[PDB]
């Protein structure tokens, strides 16, 4: 009830540290986005040991529940970190983005970047025969306050890419497609 | 005057060269282009353009056919090939001038006189240059082997009469070893190919490779300019020149030049060419080549001599004599040239890699720096050309000031998107041995015995850049928590006085603490103080930072939330892993668990249909090489490679359909 009250208000993260089994696994399907820990993290709502005893089928830990099958299969987890300390590095810059509360506008900070510059490497990027190619992200990179982007499921639904960064000072999203 | 329109018959920074000086001339500039060259530089630079063919060159700068329909479409009066592709073609050249345009460059008559090895050798001998004598038949006696020698001279080589590889040579200098290695060779090279008749001719210690360039003139005259010792080299090609050699005095380039000239004005070589000469340890110097074409290395000449080449070729086709006498040629200070190739050092001296470039800065604001670049950011390097990226030129008043102005150009040039071999240039620049002077032609050879390595840092070097690195660390972090007040929600500044930080390098962790007094960081490093003040200015591809008074520029190439960090120092990038004292300390319990690298196991992205192959077995492969192209939805998703190396196994051909995860090709 209050993760559903939540919404639209503050933003809710939810880090997966560990394995999450029966009604805890619904809290990161209401909060904004869901993190895991890469072989450290699971997601399910039943054990292995009830899906052999239901159904004549074979699975382990990983399979049923990792964090590879989430972040690359089901996309349901947004993103795995490779071990605990590198995810709350991680999560500390993501958290860096995000305003405090949906009243407050989209943060601004201190930026070096001139906004007035230009970028040249974009002119040849997009070849002219249409069934060639390319990588958006390059596009994406080069326009981004400093060449940061936060990518959103790197592994999941590859043809669409969407993700955080900056300009000019001021948060914002990036919707595209990936043509490759 | 001169011409109204010359056509470039070439690509890339030379076709810029000459482009720019007919603007400078007041002439109209043609350029040729492949598909994929259609937007490179020298094509944007030129006032007219012609399309000639495909990405290869043997369809675009090697089809003489096409570029003849191209010099009369655009009626076009003289062509400049530059270098390369077309510049000793005969057939064009004659095909050429039968249609009354001129040909900047040699006619076909000295392209023939050098054609081979005994044109040239009798040329020396005419002319009088030197071409030091062998013996002219078979060494048979154990005898004649050392007296021979004692006639025309002392260091004597044995080698085959036919062949090559080591098949029965010896290096001699005394009499006793000479008879040994004829004997040796003379009884056991029989067994190798069947033959066993050596001969003897004579040979130099500790070679330098030094040029001599000469200009010809159409009415008989020509002159000589400065040298250029081209000692630094790999796999048969220069990288780094020097102008005022060092290993010839007044009365030695007199003696040299003259006989370059003697050779140019006997076969009345009326073009710009050089004559290279090799010199041994003891300044006794011998003819070793002539050759006809304007050389990459005629950018180093001008800055000391203070002449335009490109200018004077194109005045001497039209038909004007030499504006220069001999008297006015001298040495104005010094220049040394570094070529920039996209190529990684590391795998056997420069191995082509393959990409975009995403960010590219000259160092044109420095002083005594001149760039001769082809590219411009948003460039393609591919398979299908030299890998030249560019020629980096520094000149100054004294070999120290050159040498020092070099290696900042080489700092402040920012190469972005592909590899590239500044880390090899830096540090060869700053041998004790080049500084010195003490180069051969195999000087990288016994340097770098065991391959590249990158540039060693001495202790006051490591602590300067964990001192930067630490510093530029917390300027991050700092930055990180300035934001725009919200005065619904205030935010306050954690009070951090010291920043306790654990540095790893290579496999070593230092204890590194810095604080923050405004515009300059104190940073201990394991016991040792350090001010490190900068402007921090965190968006610029080059940051300029003072370190205890030494001033450094360095470029922060990447960074991670992880304390993962990729700076470049003295031209080498350094992975540095910077973590809090409280991250480090907890870091411990980590598992490590280690991956498999299946870089060689090359698999179909996305399911379709094959519609080329690059590879069979055997070939090469660059990393980001392309080596397959599947086609699906009428695309061409193109799959290159992660690894270099050769492939093992080509797995799906041409013409077979796949789905997502097969393995298209397997690499070794
Ligand atoms: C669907 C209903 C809901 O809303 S959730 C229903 C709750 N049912 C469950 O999740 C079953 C509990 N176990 C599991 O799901 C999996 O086997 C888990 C525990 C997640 C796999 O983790 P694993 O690394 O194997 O841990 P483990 O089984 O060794 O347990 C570690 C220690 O914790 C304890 N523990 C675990 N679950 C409970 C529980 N529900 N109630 C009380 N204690 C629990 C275990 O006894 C164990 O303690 P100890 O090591 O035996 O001293």
Known sequence: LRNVTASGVIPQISLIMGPCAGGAVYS??????????????????????????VTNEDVTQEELGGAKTHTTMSGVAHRAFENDVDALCNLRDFFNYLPLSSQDPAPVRECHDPSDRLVPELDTIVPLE???????????????DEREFFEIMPNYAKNIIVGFARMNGRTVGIVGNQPK | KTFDKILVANRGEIACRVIRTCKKMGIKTVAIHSDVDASSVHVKMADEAVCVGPAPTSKSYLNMDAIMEAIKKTRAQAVHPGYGFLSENKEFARCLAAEDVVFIGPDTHAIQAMGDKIESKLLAKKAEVNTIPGFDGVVKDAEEAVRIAREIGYPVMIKASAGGGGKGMRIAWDDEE????????????????????????????????????????????????????????????????????????????????????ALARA?????????????????????????????????????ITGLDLVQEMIRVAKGYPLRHKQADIRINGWAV????????????????????????????????????????????????????????????????????????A?????????????????????????????????????????????HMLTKSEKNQLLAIASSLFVAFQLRAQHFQENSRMPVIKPDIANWELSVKLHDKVHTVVASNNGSVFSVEVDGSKLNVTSTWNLASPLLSVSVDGTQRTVQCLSREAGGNMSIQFLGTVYKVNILTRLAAELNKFMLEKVTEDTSSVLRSPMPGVVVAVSVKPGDAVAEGQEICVIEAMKMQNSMTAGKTGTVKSVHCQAGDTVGEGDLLVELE
Not at chain 1, 130 to 144: C, F, G
Not at chain 2, 212 to 241: F, P, T
């Open chain 1, 130 to 144: 249409s069934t060639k190619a390319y990588n958006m992200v390059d596009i994406i990179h080069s326009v981004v």
């Open chain 2, 178 to 261: 000479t008879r040994d290695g004829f004997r040796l060779s003379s009884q056991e090279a029989a067994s190798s190919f069947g033959d066993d008749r050596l001969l003897i001719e004579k040979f130099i210690d500790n070679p330098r490779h030094i040029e001599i360039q000469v200009l010809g003139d159409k009415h008989g005259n020509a002159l000589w300019l400065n040298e250029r010792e081209c000692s630094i080299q790999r796999r048969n090609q220069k990288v780094v020149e020097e102008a005022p050699s060092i290993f010839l005095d007044a009365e030695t380039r007199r003696a040299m030049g003259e006989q370059a000239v």
């Open chain 2, 337 to 408: 040239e570094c070529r920039v190739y996209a190529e990684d050092p590391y795998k056997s001296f420069g191995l082509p890699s393959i990409g975009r470039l995403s960010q590219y800065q000259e160092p044109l604001h420095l002083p005594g720096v001149r760039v001769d670049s082809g590219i411009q950011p948003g460039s393609d390097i591919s398979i299908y050309y030299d890998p030249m990226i560019s020629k980096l030129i520094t000149y100054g008043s004294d070999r120290t000031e050159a040498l020092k102005r070099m290696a900042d």
């Open chain 2, 267 to 303: 076969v009345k070589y009326s073009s710009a060419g050089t004559v290279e000469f090799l010199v041994d340890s003891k300044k006794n110097f011998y003819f070793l080549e002539m050759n006809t074409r304007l050389q990459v290395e005629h950018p180093v000449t001008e800055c």
């Open chain 2, 410 to 454: 080489l700092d402040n040039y920012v190469i972005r998107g592909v590899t590239h071999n500044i880390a090899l240039l830096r540090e060869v620049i700053i041998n004790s041995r080049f500084v010195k002077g003490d180069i051969s032609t195999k000087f990288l050879s016994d340097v770098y015995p065991d391959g590249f390595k990158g």
């Open chain 1, 28 to 53: 990161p399907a209401l909060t904004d986005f869901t993190f895991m820990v890469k072989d450290t993290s699971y997601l399910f709502i039943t054990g292995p040991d009830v899906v052999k005893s």
